[PDB]
C-alpha cells in the first residue's frame, strides 16, 4: 500500500470508457509514460481483491499484441490500474480523419489476427474486437486493449456481437472472428453495419438476417475476406490462422510502419481545424 497519487502524475484524459477514466500518465520515479485506468469500487470492495488477482496474472502474459498490465494500486475505494501507454491513438480515433484504404486495412487486420492467433495460457479469455479497442504505437505497432479473463445491469452495444452470442449459445473464439469481420467493415466504411438503426432493433435482427456485407466498390477479395468472417454458422467461420493466409491479407499487407501514415493523416486533420 503505497499511494498512487504520489507515485504517478496524470496528464491528459484519453478515455471516457465504462467503469471510469483512462489517463495518459507518468511514473514519478522512473519517468515511464503509462496508461492509468481509474475505477471506483465504492460499494464493491469485495470485488477489489479479485480484480487485482486478475491484473497480476495478466501482467505475466507474454503477448506483444495486447497492452501490458503493470499492476494496480488501491486508493480509497478507487483502483488505479497501470498499463502500457500507446501513443498513436485507437483506430476509431484515426477514423475521424476518414476511412482507411485497403492496404492500411489489410496491414491492420494482419496484426490483429497475429494477436488472435497467439496461444494464451490464461483460463477463460474474453475479447472485445472493435476499432475503439485497436491501439497504435507511435511506430505503428498494433495492440488490442480488450484483453482479459472471467452488478452490471445493462445489455450493452450489439453492433459487433455474433449471432450465437445473442442466441445465448455457448460461444467460443469464433465469435471474435465475427467481430473481426464487423471491425473490417468499420475500418472501410467508418462505422459498423446498421449503425443508423436503434440498438435493440439491431440486437434482434442479427440472428435472423443474412450477415451484413461491405457496401462500396472494394476488391472482390476484401469482400470475400469479410464474407468468410461473417458466416452465420460458427463452425464454418475460419480460424485466425486460416485468415492470416487469406489472399486479401497476403496480397495487400505492408510493413506495419506504413500505418504511421494514419497517425500523420490524423495530425493534419487536427492541423486543418478539427476537420
Ligand atoms: N480501458 C480501456 C480500453 C481503451 C480503449 C481505447 C482507448 N483509447 C485511447 N487509448 C490511448 N492510449 C492507451 C490506452 C492504453 C490502455 C488501454 C488503457 N494504453 N494506451 C490513446 C493514446 C493517445 C490518443 C488516443 C488514445 N485513445 C483507451 C482505453
Numbering used by the authors: 17 to 166, 176 to 300
From the paper:
Here we present the crystal structure of the unphosphorylated kinase domain of human MST4 refined at 2.35 Å resolution in complex with an ATP mimetic quinazoline inhibitor. Interestingly, this structure has captured MST4 in its inactive form with a partially disordered, unphosphorylated A-loop. Surprisingly, in the inactive structure of MST4 the αC helix is adopting a ‘swung-up’ conformation, bringing the N-terminal region of the αC helix closer to the N-terminus of the kinase domain. The approximately 13 degrees swinging motion (when compared to the same helix in MST3) allows the A-loop to also swing towards the N-lobe, resulting in the conformation captured in the crystal of MST4. In addition to the two hydrogen bonds observed in the structure of MST3 in complex with staurosporine, the glutamic acid carbonyl (Glu100) is involved in a third hydrogen bond to the pyrazole group of the quinazoline inhibitor in MST4. Additionally electron density data has identified the positions of seven cadmium ions in the asymmetric unit in the crystal structure of MST4, two of which participates in the binding of the ligand in each monomer. More critically, the canonical Thr178 to be phosphorylated is found in close proximity to the phosphate transfer site of the neighboring molecule in the dimer.
MST4 has been shown to phosphorylate the actin remodeler Ezrin at its regulatory residue T567 resulting in transmission of cell polarization signals.
